[PDB]
């Protein structure tokens, strides 16, 4: 799948 | 309400959509993905993606951490091999404060020494949260197998790079890539002249190609289950040829539209349902970057049942390339495509994800209605090629799990 | 414009009703897409031990055989239409729903009559799925978070129906019948206890005919609730062979209509959450979170506020190593007693401004909107507009919190759980003695 | 498994004021 | 040198040199080529499974019974083979004999001794990789070949903490077998060994499909290590020696300490234009099913392909016929030397004795070896390089790779 | 070079 990273200050880390 | 869309002489795009909604929302899409990394600065964006919430000039790390949670907003960061977004959220009554917090991250980051050293070993954590979801080193290896220089560079950071990263190494990276010519100050739930006022005061400031080669990587990891992928050189976005794959995606298999569904309409998963009598999961793989894209599929199965499954897919596509096809599956596949686009942008976030992504690759926003017409104008003789380019084209492959019965490309 | 003006500009929902008993509502919007679903009153709360897990077993055959669209023909027509399909069940509520486009909406409603009412339940699929279920109860051994809440509900509500799981024991799944499902179907799927809802670019009257078309043939004609009590009890599935230990603790919740739930959702957010990724670390606001980032005690924790009819569950879930459990709890209780007694007004404004962005950002699209609608229209009665959620919150101050937390945290009889190396896990007595400051 | 799991009965040990599962607590807890 | 064979396929040899230091080596076909996918990292454990429980003795007693007489118990192991070398004085051979066979003939492989011995693998795995060659070089096999020789000697990480003792008994009972072993000895008489095996050893994998592969390791290490090879030939064929002489034609490493290797056609060929350090030599491997041939590079990051494109060109010069005879006879004289110099030592001597006894069933004295070297053709030394250049390729490297090219480049 | 492993009870570990 077209993977994408995602972090934040308050959104939990994730992987698309 | 309609979508403003402008451009400054400095190459700095702005848009805005005052929907009169409560939740203001801003996203600053930028071209800073790890394709712009060279060999020596790898695993950098993985750090920069967490370098948010650090010291600035206009503010401290502490104050920003609290100043947001007082109004109760957010500071999320999407980052791709192309791009690097600084998404936020808040209520519209306090946008002016959160604006200032943002730009100080991008415009006046000091990147001091000691805050980084505490923040480096975080990478070991973040690197491993993904790889609990095992896709995220299979999939990186495709780029690292197929492509060479830019897109081969993973989002995440290798181990050894940790404890060796320099702050100076960022200032070169920042001063070269957070630039008024290649940015996009998108907003939402907010008026346009405001954003026009901000950038002119603070953002008033100033890599190679993806040479496809054909590569192959293997990972005997002892994991009981299998993960694999076979692809071919695709086309970049903008070309209607790109959509020809993205419709073929839905022809072939797009994942379960139905919970616990047998995906019967999908020509692929149906094609393996014969002969096989055990679990497996598989779908089309479509990627479409600016320089190029990638297309193929992604496999899940047991160890002994890897090539037994793939040799349906690699055959099933050849059936398509040999002209064997019907029209309702296509129009069905189009209707799938026409759905998932709107359904993706149903949410403001997923909406936002499309707005500036066009503003960077293109310099224009296409409303969805115009998108559907280009989908309407697709040719079966291009959907074929398409698969012919896949089959006739050079190949790249990767997989993980046990590999006691995994074949190679030529097999 | 402003915030308060924005909430008044929202599309105010529209409600309908039928002779059979089926509530219907919707909300127009400028979204060209749309979604529809069927939120109802049914779950493991009403199944007995003989039919436990059944409503989950209903979930897997309802899309695998009907009277007019048998087999994958039903599954086919969606993929031909280009839409998604999704479902889930809860201990009280169950929901089927669709995401599709506006113009193809009429085809959708025609299906759910063929699904809900006219399910076929082929014996082959009954037996095939009967293996699929037993495949998953092996899988959910891995879903350690879901293990805990399953244990937790099984303790505080012991002896009641609600202690049941949602998927049920393996045994009943290996004894279930077509007829128990027929009876179960024949009692719970009824108009007076069902809801239809949708959102997107539609109109409330395009829909009203379809319900009068299809679901007008529904049987519009049933026990009521036993008050499910609460218990303060401890459970512990000691297991040292694992890396870590998912842990949970909670107390009695008030329930849906009880208004102070607004206050508690703040206090959960006053304490907030943290999981091993937020670069704030030391700089964070929740004193719990800062210490957890300081000394790296835990790896993740979360809070919650469940709402059931006359009760709910308030508590938290946290995840740490076997050499750190006691201190987290000592700090954790150290926060609850703080709010029972000493709650700073400025810190309240933190959470009041957290919760606004919660419900709003929760409502980003159409599917979340109809989660609330199909849920509120079985719990609260009406829907509550967002301007009303705000006015309730604006009444809040620290005087309220010190009354509420004193009512539901302080000195109560909590419920505990644990699955992992809980060697450090103190006793329920010590935990309760740590519950009241001084 | 972890769902076939069941809790036994303490009705031989509990207080009389809570044995009726159909009732609710909070009416005797203040006394208990 | 005695040299015999039993009906069970079990070879024996012996050479009573009247020396003080007795010495025994039991060359066996048990290299990790015989491992399948599921039993990987096994020989890395079995290579340390020595000094464990037996039936005829305990782990403790063997550890002390050797050091009392002051002997040794060393274990060489290759992708083909697995040797149990020992040492002692000739006055106490009878004891140390019994200690050996109990390792191979009656190993229990109990549970708990293994669990303590597994995490040792993390140590041994890393001692090598302080010497960075030993994951570059493994990757060649894992890149070029697929099934058998691709399997490394050492053990992957994840395999640790997952190995089974039963998994060995299948491996042992299938591969420590009287048909494919060689009870070599030294400093000892022949009838003794004839007596031992008949009492205790009286008991009963795929091919290396070359494919063409490529692996890369951006490790951040300042220096570079790289290798480019081609499908070679197996031993026994005189074509094999044609490479092993070409090895010395091209470059065989420093015969001279701190020497500029001027006679080596390769290192000389890079000495022009380059003005910085680098080190490089021929790579020759020759297994039973096949071999491998090429070279092994060391340089800086920016100066990888700048160097390789001399080597890949230098070999083409040879393949185009450009060559002289004295370099060949010089290269032969190098080859004729290193063979004898290798077997000058009893250990290195022993390393040759049974290695032939497994691949072949005959020992060739060195004199006969030199004649086959004498009968080599320049038209084969050419293809040779033509097979290299014209043949399919496999490659691997590590270090920084900011300027490392691929094969086709 | 044709690398080979070597361990022992008393020979130090080595790599050919």
Residue numbers in the entry:
A (entry chain V), F (entry chain I): 62 to 77
B (entry chain O): 22 to 227, 234 to 438
C (entry chain N): 2 to 222, 228 to 444
D (entry chain R): 1 to 32
E (entry chain B): 24 to 227, 234 to 438
Original paper wording:
1 is the central component of the mitochondrial electron-transfer chain which is responsible for the electron flow from ubiquinol to cytochrome c.
In the apo structure there is weak density for the natural substrate, ubiquinone, at the Qi site, which is consistent with several studies that found ubiquinone bound to the Qi site. Owing to the lower resolution of the apo map, the side chains of the neighbouring amino-acid residues could not be unambiguously modelled into the density for all residues; however, many could be placed into their approximate positions. Moreover, the poorest resolved region in each map was consistently the Rieske protein, which was at ∼6 Å resolution in all maps. This could suggest that rather than being in distinct conformations, the Rieske protein is more flexible but does not adopt multiple positions.
